[PDB]
């Protein structure tokens, strides 16, 4: 159990026996209670997860960013936009640090209709447990961390999880480089412990089963044990703003935030990947469906990175 199956595959909130009218439209006038400020509230929150936005609304700028950060885009014509809520779209919002209350409050504030309880339930189901805890990997130490001790305290009550924790501490630094000693700054909002090297594989199932998926982050920079290959980007590599933000989203905290990146065909997708590899400066495994991608990557690495034919291998 690692795919967080329930909200993804079970989709508890998908309607059945929908009150489809004679015209064939879903009659949600009754399901979506009428609410005031039809001119100031730019959203419609359909109970099936679809959301509609007005590109001409005065708050469209914020509402667009709001929907872009919370829902998957469907269509963006000149005057109206369509978005669809999904567990993965919601989990992406949670991992950014957005709270269920804030999401519900701003939705209720921007929605022309009251938010349907089924969508509010889907919001809860996809925000309460979906990403409140992080699995740091620094110095080869698997540290489990959460912004709130409340989340880990509940998690730590699990006897199987308790068997995973390791009693270790970790040091500071010397005057040669006492920033690692000054890394004791901001231990507020920070609580973590090490987990035994081999328990992770089983603990992951247990935490996801326990409804607390771990946000794994690899601290490639301070990991001393995995040797660096001095990988670096060629001056030919210039990051486009979307690429820069995509990497910012990934490396924003400083560690490689594991996850999925979506880049439409034609983007400098390879430049983003090569930059990520050049940023990690650790040995990288790359997977494709054909030897063509393998040599296509190799050629793109040659043009944007220092990595040699003694170092890139098919």
């Amino acid at each position: 159990p690692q795919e967080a199956v329930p909200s993804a595959a079970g989709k508890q909130v998908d309607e059945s026996g929908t009150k489809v009218d004679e015209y064939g439209a879903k009659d949600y006038r009754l399901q979506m209670p009428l609410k005031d400020d039809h001119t100031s509230r730019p959203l419609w929150v359909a109970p099936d997860g679809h959301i509609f936005l007005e590109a001409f609304s005065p708050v469209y700028k914020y509402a667009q960013d709001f929907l872009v950060a919370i829902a998957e885009p469907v269509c963006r014509p000149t005057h109206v936009h369509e978005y669809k809520l999904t567990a993965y779209s919601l989990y992406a919002a949670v991992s950014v640090g957005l709270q269920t209350s804030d999401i519900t409050e701003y939705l209720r504030k921007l929605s022309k209709t009251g938010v349907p309880d089924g969508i509010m339930q889907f919001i809860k189901l996809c925000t309460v447990s979906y990403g409140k805890v992080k699995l740091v990997l620094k110095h080869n130490r698997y540290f489990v961390e959460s912004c709130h001790p409340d989340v880990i305290q509940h998690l730590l009550q699990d006897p199987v999880i308790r068997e995973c924790r390791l009693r270790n501490s970790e040091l500071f630094d010397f005057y040669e480089q006492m920033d690692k000693d000054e890394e004791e700054e901001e231990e507020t909002q920070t609580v973590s412990f090490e987990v035994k090297q081999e328990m992770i594989e089983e603990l992951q199932k247990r935490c996801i089963h326990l409804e607390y998926p771990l946000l794994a982050e690899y601290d490639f920079r301070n990991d001393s044990v995995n040797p660096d290959i001095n990988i670096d980007l060629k001056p030919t590599a210039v990051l486009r703003p979307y690429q820069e933000k995509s990497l910012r989203k990934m490396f924003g905290n400083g560690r490689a935030r594991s996850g999925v990146i979506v880049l439409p065909c034609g983007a400098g997708k390879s430049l983003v990947g090569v930059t990520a590899a050049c940023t990690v400066r650790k040995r990288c495994l790359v997977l494709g469906n054909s030897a063509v991608s393998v040599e296509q990557w190799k050629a793109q690495f040659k043009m944007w990175s220092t990595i040699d034919d003694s170092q890139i291998c098919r």
């Binding site: 005057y175 040669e176 000054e182 700054e185 940023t279």
Partner: protein, 304 residues
């Protein structure tokens, strides 16, 4: 009397001195003249810094070259670049020249590199100052410790932007420094890491302090080192400068600094004449005869 030292709490300890007053004064302006920011984060998300004991790390040098190149196109008139050490400066320039970055910088502004030769210093400053006034534009680069940060004031068009590459730590001559540091631990109980921070911060404050000398003067200032983001280091900068060093501009990306600079330049390149200065930041005899001047200025003073 000048505004360059901070924190004031360390000088009575260091100088084994006890002043009657330990005050500071807030820069009072109707239109700010200064936008201190810490661009500690590269576009490639590399933590731009010199934390690595000044070790050869091309990734930060590369990022330093990218920042300077784009900033050379953004800042008008002259730029003044301060390195943490002369060695690192020379090492850095050689890399940027080898990587060709330096040629793109020349296209943007005339580079003038400092050297211990008074002939170089005098000629560089001669050509730089007038290059900043002729049709072209120039970009002075020097070391945060050298006399250039001491004898030259970057007034008005000269050095409209000051860039501090890395925290100015002198880890060379550590033995003599250790001895003085140790003696400070002994008779003054001053922590070495605390003193080191202060000592570098005061040098950064020197470059910044010489970047402005009037109200019809302004200076962009980039602190290209993650270190500066620590509350301790930021907290030890001059309080009147910290006022403009808003958290929102901490660990900015290169692009953010470029955009903020374009914005900051746009916001202050606009006409603002002597008559416009009489609204706030300038008090005439009429305002002096008005007791308001007596009560309003009270809050300008600061203490530490």
């Amino acid at each position: 009397t000048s505004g360059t030292l901070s924190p004031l709490d360390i000088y009575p300890k260091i100088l084994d001195f006890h002043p009657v007053t330990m005050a500071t004064f807030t820069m009072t302006l109707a239109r700010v003249c200064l936008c201190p920011m810490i661009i500690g984060r590269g576009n490639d998300q590399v933590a731009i810094s010199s934390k690595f004991e000044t070790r050869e790390d091309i990734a930060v040098i590369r990022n330093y070259g990218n920042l300077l190149l784009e900033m050379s196109a953004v800042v008008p008139d002259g730029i003044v670049a301060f390195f943490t050490s002369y060695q690192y400066m020379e090492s850095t320039v050689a890399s940027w020249y080898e990587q060709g970055i330096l040629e793109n910088i020349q296209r943007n502004k005339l580079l003038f590199i400092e050297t211990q030769d008074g002939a170089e210093t005098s000629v560089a400053l001669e050509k730089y100052q007038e290059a900043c006034e002729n049709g072209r534009g120039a970009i002075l680069l020097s070391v945060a410790r050298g006399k250039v940060s001491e004898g030259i004031d970057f007034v008005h068009h000269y050095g409209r932007a000051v860039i501090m590459f890395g925290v100015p730590y002198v880890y060379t001559q550590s033995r003599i420094l250790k001895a003085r540091l140790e003696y400070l631990r002994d008779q003054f109980q001053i922590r070495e890491n605390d003193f080191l921070t202060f000592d570098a911060m005061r040098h950064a404050a020197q470059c910044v302090g010489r970047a402005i000398r009037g109200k019809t003067d302004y200076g962009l200032m980039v602190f290209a080192d993650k270190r500066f983001a620590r509350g301790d280091k930021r907290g030890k900068l001059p309080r009147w400068i910290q006022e403009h060093l808003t958290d929102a501009n901490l660990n900015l990306t290169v692009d953010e600094g470029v955009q903020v600079a374009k914005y900051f330049l746009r916001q202050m390149a606009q006409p603002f004449h002597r008559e416009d200065q009489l609204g706030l930041s300038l008090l005439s005899l009429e305002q002096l005869e008005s007791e308001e001047t007596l009560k309003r200025i009270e809050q300008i003073a600061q203490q530490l």
